[PDB]
Write a protein that binds this DNA or RNA. Structure first.
Ligand SMILES: Nc1ncnc2c1ncn2[C@H]1C[C@H](O)[C@@H](COP(=O)(O)OP(=O)(O)OP(=O)(O)O)O1
Ligand SMILES: [Ca+2]
Ligand SMILES: [Ca+2]
Ligand SMILES: [Mg+2]
Length: 341
DNA sequence: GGCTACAGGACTC
DNA sequence: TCATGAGTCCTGTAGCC
């Protein structure tokens, strides 16, 4: 199998540049403003000019400003990036029926039946990169390999605006040499646990007793890492169907006063239902983030779809449960719907 | 023993 | 006054057959 993975470069930032060319060259920072105070919030992403200096997704907007006070700070415009994204995705569909849209800026394409080898695949990659650039003037990075994980790793190594192929021989080299921390699905917490077991490379998971690896990172991640180490990983490119829709908002000030929290919860429900658009959920979860930034939640599944009215009344009972069971103050409140009909 | 629902954990974008 | 927001998969625990 030959998988071609596409990942758009510094996406939210690059779209803003396409919409306003005068931005190219300067450091651009797309922000998610929370509204508590002046500049409260975090960075969604920033173009590479800004990243060279440490301004990247996740950091406080206030910190980014300390580092780059004169950078251009723009409020995130999700809807816009989504429309642009949707158009690029349709361009990729012309290259394969077997395509998996993994997120707002990623797609995996099974081009096994389109090309005969990696040479042809690489060339197909260029053709794709050019098409997208001509049609939308958006640069993306292409990753090509025997499966989804290594096609992704291939792209991570070639961005931005790149294209890389990881052939069978290189797959064997990477299992031996690639920092296991760079393996998709291995975050700091797991990486740390693995470093503690002397596990720094995929191949190392082969010499450690399974029960020990399992007991440390869990059965699923253990089998996953091992399957990759044995070069026996296979995951099909499948159309993804959204399983849940939700909205969570930050409150002006922390609280655990039901009436003060209600308006935020209701706003979150309103927006969620708008997003649901025709999908009827059978399950609802109220999600709260406490002052100490811990996430707590309570949910319920019904034997029938949940009407907006039922969502309101039930969300209150669920929040109440949270309040009655947790003494901390709430910082962010929201809701999430699932188990669609 | 293992399925199911619920809540928390971890990861990725 | 650091600390967004969205969505997915896995696991521990307890009920139940
Ligand atoms: N922590 C986050 N919070 C909010 N939005 C985020 C977060 N991480 C990523 N995003 C958004 C910003 C990006 O434009 C988009 C895709 O992520 P990702 O590929 O990892 O960043 P990027 O497109 O800016 O990529 P790159 O490093 O690939 O050039 O999703
Ligand atoms: Ca990207
Ligand atoms: Ca990692
Ligand atoms: Mg990516």
């Amino acid at each position: 199998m030959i998988v071609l993975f596409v990942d758009f470069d510094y996406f939210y930032a690059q779209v803003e540049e396409v919409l306003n060319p005068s931005l190219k060259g300067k450091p651009v920072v797309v922000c998610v403003f929370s509204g508590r105070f002046e500049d409260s919030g975090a960075v969604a992403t920033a173009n590479y000019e800004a990243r060279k200096f440490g301004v990247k997704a996740g950091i406080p907007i206030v910190e980014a400003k300390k580092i780059l006070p004169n950078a251009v700070y723009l409020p995130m415009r999700k809807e816009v990036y989504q429309q642009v994204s949707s158009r690029i995705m349709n361009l990729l569909r012309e290259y394969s029926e077997k395509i998996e849209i993994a997120s707002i800026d990623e797609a995996y394409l099974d081009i096994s039946d389109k090309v005969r080898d990696y040479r042809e695949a690489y060339n197909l990659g260029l053709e794709i990169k050019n098409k997208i650039l001509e049609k939308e003037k958006i640069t993306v990075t292409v990753g090509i390999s025997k499966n989804k994980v290594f096609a992704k790793i291939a792209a991570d190594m070639a961005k931005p605006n790149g294209i890389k192929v990881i052939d069978d021989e290189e797959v064997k080299r990477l299992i031996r040499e690639l920092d296991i921390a760079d393996v998709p699905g291995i975050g700091n917490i797991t990486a740390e646990k693995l470093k503690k077991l002397g596990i720094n490379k995929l191949v190392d998971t082969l010499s450690i007793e399974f029960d020990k690896l399992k007991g440390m990172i869990g059965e699923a991640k253990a089998k996953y890492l091992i399957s990759l180490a044995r070069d026996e990983y296979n995951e099909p490119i499948r159309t993804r169907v959204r399983k849940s829709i939700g909205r969570i908002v930050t409150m002006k000030r922390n609280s655990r006063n039901l009436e003060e929290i209600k308006p935020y919860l209701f706003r979150a429900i309103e927006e969620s239902y708008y997003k649901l658009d025709k999908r009827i959920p059978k399950a609802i979860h109220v999600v709260a983030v406490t002052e100490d930034l811990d996430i707590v939640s309570r949910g319920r599944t019904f034997p029938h779809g949940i009407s907006k009215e039922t969502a309101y009344s039930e969300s209150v009972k669920l929040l109440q449960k949270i309040l009655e069971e947790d003494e901390r103050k709430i910082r962010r409140i929201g809701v999430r719907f699932s188990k669609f009909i």
